[PDB]
Design an enzyme around this catalytic site. Structure first.
Site, PDB file in Angstrom:
ATOM      1  N   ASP A   1       3.668   2.833   8.017  1.00  0.00           N
ATOM      2  CA  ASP A   1       2.485   1.981   8.089  1.00  0.00           C
ATOM      3  C   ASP A   1       2.680   0.664   7.361  1.00  0.00           C
ATOM      4  OD1 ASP A   1       0.001   1.057   8.799  1.00  0.00           O
ATOM      5  OD2 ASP A   1      -1.136   2.660   7.821  1.00  0.00           O
TER       6      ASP A   1
ATOM      7  N   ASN B   1       1.489   7.557   3.040  1.00  0.00           N
ATOM      8  CA  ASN B   1       2.441   6.714   3.736  1.00  0.00           C
ATOM      9  C   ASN B   1       3.870   7.193   3.561  1.00  0.00           C
ATOM     10  OD1 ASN B   1       0.709   4.944   5.034  1.00  0.00           O
ATOM     11  ND2 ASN B   1       0.529   3.612   3.228  1.00  0.00           N
TER      12      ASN B   1
ATOM     13  N   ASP C   1       0.839  -1.194   0.000  1.00  0.00           N
ATOM     14  CA  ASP C   1       0.000   0.000   0.000  1.00  0.00           C
ATOM     15  C   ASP C   1       0.878   1.250   0.000  1.00  0.00           C
ATOM     16  OD1 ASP C   1      -2.424   1.387  -0.123  1.00  0.00           O
ATOM     17  OD2 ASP C   1      -2.756   1.327   2.057  1.00  0.00           O
TER      18      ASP C   1
HETATM   19  C1  C2V Z   1      -1.471   7.237   7.268  1.00  0.00           C
HETATM   20  N1  C2V Z   1      -0.501   6.432   8.019  1.00  0.00           N
HETATM   21  C2  C2V Z   1       0.849   7.002   7.968  1.00  0.00           C
HETATM   22  C3  C2V Z   1      -0.994   6.019   9.359  1.00  0.00           C
HETATM   23  C4  C2V Z   1      -1.729   7.089  10.180  1.00  0.00           C
HETATM   24  N2  C2V Z   1      -0.772   8.143  10.503  1.00  0.00           N
HETATM   25  C5  C2V Z   1      -0.826   9.409   9.943  1.00  0.00           C
HETATM   26  O1  C2V Z   1      -1.658   9.783   9.110  1.00  0.00           O
HETATM   27  C6  C2V Z   1       0.265  10.334  10.330  1.00  0.00           C
HETATM   28  C7  C2V Z   1       0.221  11.669   9.916  1.00  0.00           C
HETATM   29  C8  C2V Z   1       1.263  12.523  10.246  1.00  0.00           C
HETATM   30  C9  C2V Z   1       2.339  12.012  10.975  1.00  0.00           C
HETATM   31  C10 C2V Z   1       2.399  10.679  11.425  1.00  0.00           C
HETATM   32  C11 C2V Z   1       3.626  10.256  12.097  1.00  0.00           C
HETATM   33  C12 C2V Z   1       4.646  11.047  12.577  1.00  0.00           C
HETATM   34  N3  C2V Z   1       5.699  10.320  13.050  1.00  0.00           N
HETATM   35  C13 C2V Z   1       5.379   9.070  12.827  1.00  0.00           C
HETATM   36  C14 C2V Z   1       6.094   7.888  13.103  1.00  0.00           C
HETATM   37  C15 C2V Z   1       5.568   6.709  12.776  1.00  0.00           C
HETATM   38  C16 C2V Z   1       4.221   6.746  12.130  1.00  0.00           C
HETATM   39  C17 C2V Z   1       3.539   5.524  11.767  1.00  0.00           C
HETATM   40  C18 C2V Z   1       3.995   4.222  11.889  1.00  0.00           C
HETATM   41  C19 C2V Z   1       3.020   3.282  11.448  1.00  0.00           C
HETATM   42  C20 C2V Z   1       1.857   3.897  11.029  1.00  0.00           C
HETATM   43  S1  C2V Z   1       1.937   5.599  11.161  1.00  0.00           S
HETATM   44  N4  C2V Z   1       3.529   7.827  11.888  1.00  0.00           N
HETATM   45  N5  C2V Z   1       4.133   8.976  12.244  1.00  0.00           N
HETATM   46  C21 C2V Z   1       1.363   9.811  11.052  1.00  0.00           C
END
Ligand code: C2V
Length: 293
Positions: free
Chosen positions: A150, A134, A129
């Site tokens: 993700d 992502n 995906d």
């Molecule tokens: C759309 N997907 C990405 C999942 C939902 N998250 C969001 O929409 C999002 C938006 C802005 C920032 C962040 C952010 C900032 N630092 C980190 C470190 C690690 C991770 C993840 C690891 C596994 C999944 S998220 N997210 N992450 C996530």
């Protein structure tokens, strides 16, 4: 009970149907993390498998272009995957804020994306995906490296064992073999990398229809274009990489490490165009707005 006792929860970074990601601070160190919070109540044995697989995949992948796992904590009712916090936002939202954006910058971005898809594939993980949401960015203060995020839909593959691992993916980025229900593998990530490369050059997707069924037929035919005028200023080497990434025959599709040897990636200063592409910035603003809904 390690999360509730040692962490302070803050705002929500993103939300989905079956999880939530929130910023958080470790109470002892003061260091800030992103916590992915999954409800583990009344899961089937199939869901328990998927969740421990996600935690296993995230523990294994250690690479400067992949979100880094700091802890996986199981409390009663909830699982927390705690990743180092990246503060630079989404790749595509940083691009539309640039006043200078060229093929050399596109190539720089896709090279980091490719390094990460490569590292996954060397560890036998198919992400399944890849998509703009992502693709996060580290802070400009820390190097602004691209971060793949993700792995909730990722799978583990053994060598080049290919099979029908079920439908998974986002419609605009789906490979033709997944749409045919044919056995697939690592090449589905390279197909998605070609859709992202395409959008990175012109700001709109290579396959598009308001009728999703017509979208799928266009994908299955591999029928994308490089229409004038916007594509007329794009180098043929950049068009060549897209061609090798968007081949409907997955056996002949270019691989991640092979794409890291394409002259448009590894000979960037001499091969990729350095003109600003203002029409890409503008189209991408409209692209980002539509995807927000
Ligand atoms: C759309 N997907 C990405 C999942 C939902 N998250 C969001 O929409 C999002 C938006 C802005 C920032 C962040 C952010 C900032 N630092 C980190 C470190 C690690 C991770 C993840 C690891 C596994 C999944 S998220 N997210 N992450 C996530």
């Amino acid at each position: 009970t390690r999360f509730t006792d040692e962490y302070q929860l803050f705002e929500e970074l993103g939300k989905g149907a079956f999880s939530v990601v929130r910023r958080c601070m470790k109470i002892p160190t003061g260091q800030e993390y992103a916590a992915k919070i999954i409800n583990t109540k009344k899961l089937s044995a199939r869901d328990h498998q998927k969740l421990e697989r996600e935690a296993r995949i995230c523990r294994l992948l250690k690479h400067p272009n992949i979100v880094r796992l700091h802890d996986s904590i199981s409390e009663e009712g909830f699982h927390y995957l705690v990743f180092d916090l990246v503060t630079g936002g989404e790749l595509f939202e940083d691009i539309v804020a640039r006043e200078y954006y060229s093929e050399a910058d596109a190539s720089h971005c896709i090279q980091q994306i490719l390094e990460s898809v490569n590292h996954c594939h060397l560890n036998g993980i198919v992400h399944r995906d890849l998509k703009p949401e992502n693709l996060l960015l580290a802070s400009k203060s820390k190097g602004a490296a691209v971060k793949l995020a993700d792995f909730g839909l990722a799978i583990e593959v053994q060598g080049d064992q290919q099979a029908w691992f079920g439908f998974a993916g986002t419609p605009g980025y789906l490979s033709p073999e997944v749409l045919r229900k044919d056995p697939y593998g690592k090449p589905v990530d390279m197909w998605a990398c070609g859709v992202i490369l395409y959008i990175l050059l012109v700001g709109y997707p290579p396959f598009w229809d308001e009728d999703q069924h017509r979208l799928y037929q266009q994908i299955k035919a591999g029928a994308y274009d490089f229409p004038s005028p916007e594509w007329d200023t794009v180098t043929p080497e950049a068009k060549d990489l897209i061609n090798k990434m968007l081949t409907i025959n997955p056996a002949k599709r270019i691989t991640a490490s092979e794409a890291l040897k394409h002259p448009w990636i590894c000979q960037r200063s001499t091969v990729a165009s350095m003109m600003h592409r203002q029409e890409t910035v503008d189209c991408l603003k409209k692209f980002n707005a539509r995807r927000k809904l």
